[PDB]
From Swiss-Prot, chain A:
Annotated gene: CAF40
Further remarks about this protein from its record: Present with 18800 molecules/cell in log phase SD medium.
Name of the protein described by the UniProt record: Protein CAF40
Family: Belongs to the CNOT9 family.
Keyword Transcription regulation listed: yes
Annotated compartments: Cytoplasm; Nucleus
Subunit structure: Subunit of the 1.0 MDa CCR4-NOT core complex that contains CCR4, CAF1, NOT1, NOT2, NOT3, NOT4, NOT5, CAF40 and CAF130. In the complex interacts with NOT1. The core complex probably is part of a less characterized 1.9 MDa CCR4-NOT complex.
Function according to Swiss-Prot or TrEMBL: Acts as a component of the CCR4-NOT core complex, which in the nucleus seems to be a general transcription factor, and in the cytoplasm the major mRNA deadenylase involved in mRNA turnover.
GO cellular component: CCR4-NOT core complex; nucleus; P-body
Keywords: Activator, Cytoplasm, Nucleus, Repressor, Transcription, Transcription regulation
GO biological process, any: positive regulation of transcription elongation by RNA polymerase II
Swiss-Prot record, chain B:
Known partners and oligomeric status: Forms a NOT protein complex that comprises NOT1, NOT2, NOT3, NOT4 and NOT5. Subunit of the 1.0 MDa CCR4-NOT core complex that contains CCR4, CAF1, NOT1, NOT2, NOT3, NOT4, NOT5, CAF40 and CAF130. In the complex interacts with CCR4, POP2, NOT2, NOT4 and NOT5. The core complex probably is part of a less characterized 1.9 MDa CCR4-NOT complex.
Function (record text): Acts as a component of the CCR4-NOT core complex, which in the nucleus seems to be a general transcription factor, and in the cytoplasm the major mRNA deadenylase involved in mRNA turnover. The NOT protein subcomplex negatively regulates the basal and activated transcription of many genes. Preferentially affects TC-type TATA element-dependent transcription. Could directly or indirectly inhibit component(s) of the general transcription machinery.
Organism annotation: Saccharomyces cerevisiae (strain ATCC 204508 / S288c)
Protein's UniProt name: General negative regulator of transcription subunit 1
Additional information: Present with 4300 molecules/cell in log phase SD medium.
Record-stated family: Belongs to the CNOT1 family.
Intracellular or extracellular location(s): Cytoplasm; Nucleus
Domain of life: Eukaryota
């Protein structure tokens, strides 16, 4: 315990505070605590938010600055997914500061890590399966923004992007926002269609999961009959799907649900 | 508009083009101004409200609350404004320019347009907060006049902040150091 108090103190006041950010980020996986300690502590949240807002002028294009803020991001990712601090964090409108980070189109390793770390926060926010999180996210341009990520950039960030989407689709309120209109429907389908053709990996298992989810809506079930990528209907992905039972049971049902 | 659009070359120094340029900026600003201010300030006043009240639960002297409440939401709104407005403003500024080398000229003068969307989103933030801080500002006025020497607040919840430790946590009153954190940035 008491190497933590000194680091948290440093984070709020003590001059280094990047080292502390680094240290606390490394120890964030133990004791099943400190999430509450981070929130309940005075000046921490204000400070953690100050680290983030200092990266705004730097969003015009970097370096270790990007590593520093990324460490504050995992700290916020630790606060999120913690039942006590999750809904407090959510209702405090803190994560909405992570969207400008996610808006960055730069493909440099730095901005790749920036978006990747930031994506972990929102991904962790939907990790515990809370409906209020969904209805909060759908207030914002996230879903179209994830769709931008899913087709391009890195396989890692893509894996996080498809996951966040799958969570939203899983919820009844999310499956309503998407698949509300043809504009939104064909926005998601084309990207999923793209990834399949552009394709062991988890990206395939999540894509199948998303289609199986869209198979629920009848209006979507009809359009998917024609709009389903033929690759899945084929045996092309069978060999790699032999190792995953869950992915196989979902794909088989998706085909079974397809047509009649 | 004002101050000649200095400094720059080309579009600034040519009068005939100078007019349609100023017309492009104004149209650009008025387009996204309404959209930005409502959203940015909306996040600013809410996210500050929840943060300030949690940290200031034991704090008295609402003037000391107001000081740390104002500068937090003001700077946080101004930062969310500039960040939000920068991209669509320019993209619109060029889009409305071609309809009726560009980037070099506008990036010099984009400062003014940004300062308006900032100033605006700041003032509405300082406003919406003050109206939402009313109950929290009033409940301390009663507790100030009616019961003096008594300990302060604990309005709803400080279950895990009831813990002992050094000034990472709630005290009494807010120490000069803890009040210094929100006093700057």
């Amino acid at each position: 315990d008491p190497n933590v108090y000194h680091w948290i103190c440093q984070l709020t006041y003590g001059p280094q505070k990047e080292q502390a950010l680094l240290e606390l980020g490394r120890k964030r996986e133990q004791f099943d605590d400190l999430a509450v300690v981070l929130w309940s502590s005075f000046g921490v949240m204000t400070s953690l938010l100050n680290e983030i807002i200092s990266v705004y002028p730097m969003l015009q294009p970097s370096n270790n600055l990007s590593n520093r803020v990324c460490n504050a991001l995992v700290l916020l990712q630790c606060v999120a997914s913690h039942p006590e601090t999750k809904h407090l964090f959510l209702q405090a409108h803190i994560p909405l500061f992570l969207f400008p980070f996610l808006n960055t189109t730069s493909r440099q390793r730095t901005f790749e890590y920036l978006r990747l770390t930031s994506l972990g926060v929102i991904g962790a926010l939907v990790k515990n399966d809370s409906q209020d999180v969904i209805t909060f996210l759908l207030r914002t341009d996230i879903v179209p923004l994830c769709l931008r990520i899913m087709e391009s950039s890195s396989e890692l960030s893509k894996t996080v992007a498809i996951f966040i989407l799958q969570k939203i689709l899983l919820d009844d309120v999310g499956l309503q926002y998407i698949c509300a209109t043809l504009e939104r429907f064909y926005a998601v389908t084309n990207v999923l269609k793209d990834m399949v053709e552009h394709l062991p990996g988890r990206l395939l298992k999540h894509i199948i999961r998303c289609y199986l989810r869209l198979s629920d809506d009848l209006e979507a079930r009809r359009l998917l009959k024609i709009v389903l990528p033929a690759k899945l209907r084929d045996n092309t992905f069978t060999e790699v799907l032999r190792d995953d039972v869950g992915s196989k049971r979902c794909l088989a049902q998706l085909l079974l649900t397809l047509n009649e | 508009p004002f101050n000649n659009l200095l400094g720059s070359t080309i579009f600034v120094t040519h009068p005939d083009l100078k007019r349609v340029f100023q017309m492009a900026l104004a149209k650009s600003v008025r387009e996204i101004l309404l959209e930005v201010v409502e959203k940015s300030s909306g996040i600013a006043v809410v996210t500050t409200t929840k943060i300030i009240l949690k940290d200031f639960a034991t704090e008295v002297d609402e003037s000391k609350l107001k000081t740390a409440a104002i500068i937090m939401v003001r700077h946080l709104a101004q930062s969310l404004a500039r960040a939000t407005s920068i991209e669509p403003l320019k993209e619109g500024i060029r889009s409305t320019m071609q309809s009726l080398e560009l980037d070099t000229a506008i990036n010099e003068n984009i400062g003014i347009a940004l300062v308006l969307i900032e100033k605006a989103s700041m003032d509405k933030s300082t406003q919406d907060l003050a109206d939402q801080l009313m109950q929290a500002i009033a409940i301390r006025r009663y507790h100030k006049e009616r019961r003096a020497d008594q300990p302060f607040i604990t309005q709803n919840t400080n279950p895990y902040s009831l813990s002992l430790p050094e000034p990472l946590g709630l005290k009494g009153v807010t120490p000069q150091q803890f009040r210094v954190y929100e006093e700057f940035g």
